[PDB]
Subunit: 123 residues, 4 copies
């Protein structure tokens, strides 16, 4: 449901995610990371699959943040892939991939993988 | 490097995607796949880092496709993270995560992972 | 430290891991999963990097379980990659990959990825 | 299929590994890589599923290598999960996870992921 996803969310590292889910399955917003070579806010864009199922399944979504803004440029990008679960305690559970641009030679070590869980605070 | 990301790309599986790269880091276009509970075109949206570095590195980027359109709804979304490299043969090398919406009981098995290499050939 | 890793551990799904760390960096034991097409115990083998650093870094380790035993055979195998962290509350935090054998055609969907955290109970 | 996993395998990077497959599901041998803080041979231990299925599927397997030997200690371990396929050209297609031991502060960035394809050529 766009509505339930729309809002302010935080994860265990202390990062802030501000998102608006549109009618057409779109996600746009900003991300404020607490870690890495990233200073301030960064623009994020994603999609979410607007017609989930009835049942108590989660809504699948994903989004991307390129770590470049007017203050910094980390030459890397992260994509988060997960599910939105609503209720009194709404959560977004994800797995992410962080890729840094590298030379051919170090490409075998350009991607990190991990997972993040977000808790909603505001709409 | 340069506009170069913009265009039509193909992968091993036969999938095709057409993208437009904007001067400020945005990626927009459509994806049509060859495998899964997918049928037709789907919208894709992503980002790329508009200012790569100048030690022949690739340009980091990522994009998402929710698998729902006017014909099908597979209740899943795929994200591709990787880097673009130009030259006589430009390619995008990625690793992807495909998550399906499940009930909590099946959450442990909701995400698949793989890799895809796209070329304009 | 072999000693700290040796013991009985459980994760959030309710699975049991029994392991012995040997002097030479080896891990051998048994795994009892709570989920999947897996019934009973399965043999596990791994390695752990026996000389970590001084500092409060974790000890890197990994192990494999092939889901075939005398009662079942799921034609799949999982590998867990993580770090052991000791202290009063010793934990093993991992990320795993589950691969099922498939035909060439469905190979794009043969691997699942996720994460597990284990808590020690016994030595 | 059959003994077939046993032998010397090579990957794109130049890495080589020699393995012995036992009738009951065990895999043992040595790994020598071409990249990273690695120098010489390392011991590897894994498992394979000794009874694959009879719809031309691959044989699921996995193995681990801790990167410590009498010469180096990179304080990391790599696990490869994938499947073996025989035929004129047998290959092992894998995805791997490489974890480095960190302090809690750097745990978020302790694991790399990739893919490797091994052949006996
Ligand atoms: N909130 C989170 N921040 C870290 C993880 C995923 S991406 C990462 C921050 C990286 C910052 C930019 C960089 O260092 O490349 N979750
Ligand atoms: N070109 C690719 N197609 C498959 C992989 C990643 S996304 C996937 C197609 C999935 C279609 C929808 C589905 O079956 O869930 N690469
Ligand atoms: N304790 C755990 N069990 C599940 C995860 C990782 S492997 C998985 C169980 C799968 C059982 C066998 C199978 O279904 O293939 N953690
Ligand atoms: N053949 C491969 N070599 C690299 C990847 C996965 S394991 C890795 C070598 C790492 C060596 C030790 C290190 O640098 O940490 N594939």
């Amino acid at each position: 449901a766009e509505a339930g996803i729309t809002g302010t969310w935080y994860n265990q590292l202390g990062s802030t995610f501000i998102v608006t889910a549109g009618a057409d399955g779109a996600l746009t917003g900003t991300y404020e990371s607490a870690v890495g070579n990233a200073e301030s806010r960064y623009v994020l864009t994603g999609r979410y699959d607007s017609a989930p199922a009835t049942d108590g399944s989660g809504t699948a979504l994903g989004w991307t943040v390129a770590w470049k803004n007017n203050y910094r440029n980390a030459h890397s990008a992260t994509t988060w892939s997960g599910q939105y679960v609503g209720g009194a305690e709404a959560r977004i559970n994800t797995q992410w991939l962080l890729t840094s641009g590298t030379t051919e030679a170090n490409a075998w070590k350009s991607t990190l993988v991990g997972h993040d869980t977000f808790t909603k605070v505001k709409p």
